[PDB]
């Protein structure tokens, strides 16, 4: 069983005070407070083991804890391989190194590309710029009320000329879960690769690749209780390894020449150049072990119960207004009455509750609801029920004081 | 004056052990070890303040730091403005993009740039892949056998037709320092901008950018005695502010429409799509710190009296070759009589003394002097004259063993 209390342990962020208040912390979808587990994984590397990776000891223990993550993660979403794992940035850069690698080879002027209309911006921006680039068109998967896609839509947008669909997971304002594996058969049956932006699934509940038979899959170490300036990018190895470059320079080449030009080394590592950020790579394999040490279906039993209890909660919240589907994982996005998102958050914060308010970098979804922003309460693995009722009872006060 | 033995205090790595025997780390030019203060203000951010960065409290403190950030690395390269100043993974990270966001737009077919034969690879394969893309032609300002540049070359090699130099401010390999603001003259006398390449010299003297004139300057955080992950590119403020956009995502966008396109929001912001790496962030206004404080005329004495005395000190080591000028900063590149550097780096290695040997990204640079590989011993501001002893002290044991 999970233990919230032990797990909240390892987290020293959530002693502090904010305001001087207890902070309840309600924005990991934001991004993830990080367990010392982590922290002192990549503070040790510096202290104790730190050089450059790619002959001398320390430089070749360092290349060995950068490949063993990169193996730890490849088992972690099992994918058949390590080296179907590219490290970037962050989910973002992860999007955008496949709209240009992989996008400008194989998107022609006259293609279509879908999104969906719940897509971060990260997942719609870097397709707006390749199909500016190549001469495509974007379509758009359109919402239901309740938070899901009307998939009935498919049809009319899936063609002979589709060459992507790209896709949420999970989305990071309603919490909806998107059927992917279904999704991903249709598309497949007309020769379009899917990207799938998880960064709001892999902290939720176990993700299988393989299972999912997705094309590119993408997400961020900030969010998985790691640290910042990590990330990773799955790719089909067959479709990897026809990959030209993106980024230029040390590590990704093979030889370089003045005069007979340069050639480029194989997968993965094509794709990484210069430094890697070894202290984030430490950060993340130490992150992946904690959640893994904890069990990803622990984790997904006690944030279903949460959720349900703060569902049923705030039905004692006057004019409170929920947007997306009942069965959301990890956030709860809401207004209050007629209140402005920013003045609802600036109370919640002043009782030390941190929520986000604003368009959650989701503007077309925002318009979708005809509202300007929306209040976003994360519920991850190390809150807790007594959070909850400090949200529930913040929202009643400011209704009262403010109606 | 500068005390090395309280420098040192502050490098926990330093007391390490490899193979047995007291770690002499002579690598610094590859990465450089961090100082607690560096180490602990990064793990702090994640122990006590971390959030997402741009309402509520720990979110609002986070965006303050990094902007803070942004302003003292601004000032530490003397740049008129911290909005002239983009947070990038690293030099390499840098140079793609200005190769893209810059050279995309105003390089075109028939036009040339200008490298030197000294570049590293991050310094010269996003040029070669510029030059592909639009059709113009890429020169190589050539070496002299002492490891300077050949600036007789410099009028057959600048045009009306030359858009950009990319240059090195200090070679990687030999330490050869550059005359930056003539060239920096000469090619504004074209039209040409310059691109300068610093990741070797900002931790050495100081560097200011107004002074040098440069339209572009790039540098890493983790040779700067700071974490990995991070780094700087400058950029005149004129120009940054005509750039387009390289990675798009959130962040970087004014407002996304899925019906009317999508506008970008005003420069450095415009070219920092999703997350910023804000622990490698933290950690970089942190070394910055420590090196401020530290002094960069008294790193750079100190470092120049031990290079001078490991100069005169390998004048006892039969049959080794130095590659580079009398006046280089930083590195010491050499070859040990006709043994491979592969074989040399090792019994250095097994000596507890950890150089770098092979190419060192600089493969046009390799063939220029007919040599496979370099072996190159590093002197940063916290290695000892007794740690020369024990460099000089090997090769010459490595001579007798194998000669
Ligand atoms: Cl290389
Ligand atoms: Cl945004």
């Known amino acids: 069983i999970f233990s919230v209390d032990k797990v909240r342990a390892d987290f020293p962020v959530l002693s502090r005070e904010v305001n001087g208040l207890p902070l309840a912390y309600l924005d990991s979808a934001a991004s993830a407070q990080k367990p010392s587990q982590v922290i002192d994984a990549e503070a040790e590397f510096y202290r104790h083991g730190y050089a450059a990776v790619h002959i001398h000891t320390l430089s070749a223990q360092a290349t060995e804890k950068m ?99 790209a ?121 992946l072990e904690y959640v893994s040490a904890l069990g990803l279906n622990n984790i997904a039993e006690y944030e279903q119960n949460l959720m349900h209890y703060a569902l049923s909660q705030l039905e004692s919240v006057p004019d409170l207004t929920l947007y997306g589907p009942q069965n959301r994982l990890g956030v709860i996005a809401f207004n209050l009455g007629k209140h402005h998102a920013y003045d609802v958050g600036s109370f919640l914060d002043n009782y030390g509750i941190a929520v986000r308010t604003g368009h959650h970098c989701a503007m077309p979804l925002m318009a979708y609801y005809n509202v300007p922003a929306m209040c976003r309460a994360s519920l991850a693995m190390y809150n807790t029920h007594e959070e909850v009722d400090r949200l529930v009872t913040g929202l009643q006060r400011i209704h009262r004081l403010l109606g």
Chains 1, 2 share one sequence.
């Open 67 to 165: 490949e063993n993550v990169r193996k730890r993660a490849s088992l972690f979403i099992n994918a058949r391989s390590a080296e179907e794992l590219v490290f970037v940035r962050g989910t973002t850069e992860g999007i955008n190194l496949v709209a240009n690698s992989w996008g400008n080879s194989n998107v022609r002027a006259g293609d279509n590309i879908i999104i969906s209309q719940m897509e971060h911006h990260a997942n719609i921006v870097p397709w707006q710029m390749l199909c500016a680039r190549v001469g495509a068109e974007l379509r758009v998967i359109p919402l239901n009320p309740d938070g899901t896609l009307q998939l009935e839509t498919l049809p009319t947008l899936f063609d002979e000329k589709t060459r992507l669909l």
């Open 167 to 287: 896709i949420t997971h999970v989305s990071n304002v309603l919490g909806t879960e998107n059927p992917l594996a279904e999704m991903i058969t249709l598309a497949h049956q007309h020769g379009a690769k899917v990207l799938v932006d998880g960064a709001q699934a892999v902290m939720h509940h176990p993700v299988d690749v393989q299972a999912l038979d997705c094309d590119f899959y993408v997400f961020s170490g900030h969010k998985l209780y790691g640290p910042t300036g990590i990330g990773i990018l799955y790719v089909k190895e067959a479709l990897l390894q026809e990959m030209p470059p993106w980024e230029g320079g040390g590590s990704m080449i093979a030889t370089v020449s003045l005069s007979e030009g340069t050639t480029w080394t194989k997968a993965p590592w094509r794709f990484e150049a210069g430094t890697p950020n070894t202290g984030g790579i430490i950060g993340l394999g130490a992150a």
